[PDB]
């Protein structure tokens, strides 16, 4: 797949991108990767912080849905007007495909000052696509229509490849380790253990995907439910107790620095998260160095210094498995075979002395099954699926 090598742009903290052309003739734009939602959605009238958008009046092939669609987060929101028209990926697979399309006319702080996307891709399912089910996402389209293989893969470096249809054997080393994608609507995932410096954090390992587990390339931290959030903290904090830090670092909300190339990176810990494997029975683990979760900043004032940000955050809706954690693999989203594959990545991150890895199997007499069964809302239960 030598033609889709070195297709994304960004980083961690604003995004990666995606060239994708929508309408004809062809407007190119930048698209934010995200396998955290399921709605293909491309600015589409002006905005301070863009200087193109989709042009819907521009493109001769572009059909009205005659349908708004309007979708809050919980740190802003954007809304649209639904159509189709045809799309493109021109560094990716030599198809042409029409795919559903939110034409974005209002938004609230979700477009950034720099970040250089215009769009988002949701890779993720139908399940939760806005504003129902119904509304099919831009990879269910593109298998469907063109029979380009149902599995993508991602390679993030903190710069990337999205690899459409296949895995590229150059863009990783070592083991391929698969863990079952456990229900179809994000790629939720189940974690069985979590070790912070070879230590178990010794909870029910429920906790650890409660209220679910995901792999998002649209999060950047990694975030923990409370529970898990505070153990790991207090074990982190227990290994770099040589350096007392403000609180509001371990919030994420404050930069801790050091002499520029005099980083202690040893006094803190790898965390190792082990994912179901594809075997009963079977684990195997995702090691990350510190590297990933302590992120350099660079502050106008501080030049002499390297600063950092702490990329652990606290979660209320889950474990958020994002940017920063999948940065050091190649990861597999083999929608063909409900699971996720991951690799350590041929972008390596790197510490003097250890390696950020994938390792197995690791066998356990149990478990213990540690998925957590979200309660049944009435508003779930009562729509009818009719597929
Ligand atoms: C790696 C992408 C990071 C990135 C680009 S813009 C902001 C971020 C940080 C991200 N939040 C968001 N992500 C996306 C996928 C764009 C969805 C969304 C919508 C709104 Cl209305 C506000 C923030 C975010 C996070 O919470 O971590
Ligand atoms: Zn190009
Ligand atoms: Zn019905
Ligand atoms: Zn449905």
Same mark, same amino acid.
Request: contains cysteine.
């Given at each position: 797949?030598?033609?889709?090598?070195?297709?994304?742009?960004?980083?961690?903290?604003?995004?990666?991108?995606?060239?994708?052309?929508?309408?004809?003739?062809?407007? $190119?734009?930048?698209? &934010?990767?995200?396998?955290?939602?399921?709605? +293909?959605?491309?600015?589409?009238?002006?905005?301070?912080? =863009?200087?193109?958008?989709?042009?819907?009046?521009?493109?001769?092939?572009?059909?009205?849905?005659?349908?708004?669609?309007?979708?809050?987060?919980?740190?802003?929101?954007?809304?649209?007007?639904?159509?189709?028209?045809?799309? #493109?990926?021109?560094?990716?697979? @030599?198809? $042409?495909?029409?795919?559903?399309?939110?034409?974005?006319?209002?938004?609230?702080?979700?477009?950034?000052?720099?970040?250089?996307?215009?769009?988002?891709?949701?890779?993720?399912?139908?399940?939760?696509?806005?504003?129902?089910?119904?509304?099919?996402?831009?990879?269910?389209? =593109?298998?469907?229509? !063109?029979?380009?293989?149902?599995?993508? #893969?991602?390679?993030?470096?903190?710069?990337?490849?999205?690899?459409?249809?296949?895995?590229?054997?150059? =863009? /990783?080393?070592?083991? &391929?380790?698969? !863990?079952?994608?456990?229900?179809?609507?994000?790629?939720?995932?189940?974690?069985?253990?979590?070790?912070?410096?070879?230590?178990?954090?010794?909870?029910?390992?429920?906790?650890? @995907?409660?209220?679910? #587990?995901?792999?998002?390339?649209? $999060?950047? @931290?990694?975030?923990?439910?409370?529970?898990?959030?505070?153990?790991?903290?207090?074990?982190?904090?227990?290994?770099?107790?040589?350096?007392? +830090?403000?609180?509001?670092?371990?919030?994420?909300?404050?930069?801790?620095?050091?002499?520029?190339?005099?980083?202690?990176?040893?006094? +803190?810990?790898?965390?190792?998260?082990? =994912?179901?494997?594809?075997?009963?029975?079977?684990?195997?683990?995702? !090691?990350?160095?510190?590297?990933? /979760?302590?992120?350099?900043?660079?502050?106008?004032? $501080?030049?002499?210094?390297?600063?950092?940000?702490?990329?652990? #955050?606290?979660?209320?809706?889950?474990?958020?498995?994002?940017?920063?954690?999948?940065?050091?693999?190649?990861?597999?989203?083999?929608?063909?075979?409900?699971?996720?594959?991951?690799?350590?990545?041929?972008?390596?991150?790197?510490?003097?002395?250890?390696?950020?890895?994938?390792?197995?199997?690791?066998?356990?007499?149990?478990?213990?099954?540690?998925?957590? @069964?979200?309660?049944?809302?009435?508003?779930?239960?009562?729509?009818?699926?009719?597929?």
């Amino acid at each position: 797949f030598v033609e889709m090598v070195d297709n994304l742009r960004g980083k961690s903290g604003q995004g990666y991108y995606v060239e994708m052309t929508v309408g004809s003739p062809p407007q $190119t734009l930048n698209i &934010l990767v995200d396998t955290g939602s399921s709605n +293909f959605a491309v600015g589409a009238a002006p905005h301070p912080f =863009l200087h193109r958008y989709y042009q819907r009046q521009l493109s001769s092939t572009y059909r009205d849905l005659r349908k708004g669609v309007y979708v809050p987060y919980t740190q802003g929101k954007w809304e649209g007007e639904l159509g189709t028209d045809l799309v #493109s990926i021109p560094h990716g697979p @030599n198809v $042409t495909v029409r795919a559903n399309i939110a034409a974005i006319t209002e938004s609230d702080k979700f477009f950034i000052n720099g970040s250089n996307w215009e769009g988002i891709l949701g890779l993720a399912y139908a399940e939760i696509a806005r504003p129902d089910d119904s509304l099919e996402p831009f990879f269910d389209s =593109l298998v469907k229509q !063109t029979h380009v293989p149902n599995l993508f #893969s991602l390679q993030l470096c903190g710069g990337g490849s999205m690899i459409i249809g296949g895995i590229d054997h150059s =863009l /990783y080393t070592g083991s &391929l380790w698969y !863990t079952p994608i456990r229900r179809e609507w994000y790629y939720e995932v189940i974690i069985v253990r979590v070790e912070i410096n070879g230590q178990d954090l010794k909870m029910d390992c429920k906790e650890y @995907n409660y209220d679910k #587990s995901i792999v998002d390339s649209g $999060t950047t @931290n990694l975030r923990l439910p409370k529970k898990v959030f505070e153990a790991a903290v207090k074990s982190i904090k227990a290994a770099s107790s040589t350096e007392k +830090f403000p609180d509001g670092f371990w919030l994420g909300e404050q930069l801790v620095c050091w002499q520029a190339g005099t980083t202690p990176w040893n006094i +803190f810990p790898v965390i190792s998260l082990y =994912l179901m494997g594809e075997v009963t029975n079977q684990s195997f683990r995702i !090691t990350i160095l510190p590297q990933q /979760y302590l992120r350099p900043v660079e502050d106008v004032a $501080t030049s002499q210094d390297d600063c950092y940000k702490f990329a652990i #955050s606290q979660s209320s809706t889950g474990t958020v498995m994002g940017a920063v954690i999948m940065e050091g693999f190649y990861v597999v989203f083999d929608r063909a075979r409900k699971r996720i594959g991951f690799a350590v990545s041929a972008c390596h991150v790197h510490d003097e002395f250890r390696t950020a890895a994938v390792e197995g199997p690791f066998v356990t007499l149990d478990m213990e099954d540690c998925g957590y @069964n979200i309660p049944q809302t009435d508003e779930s239960r009562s729509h009818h699926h009719h597929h």
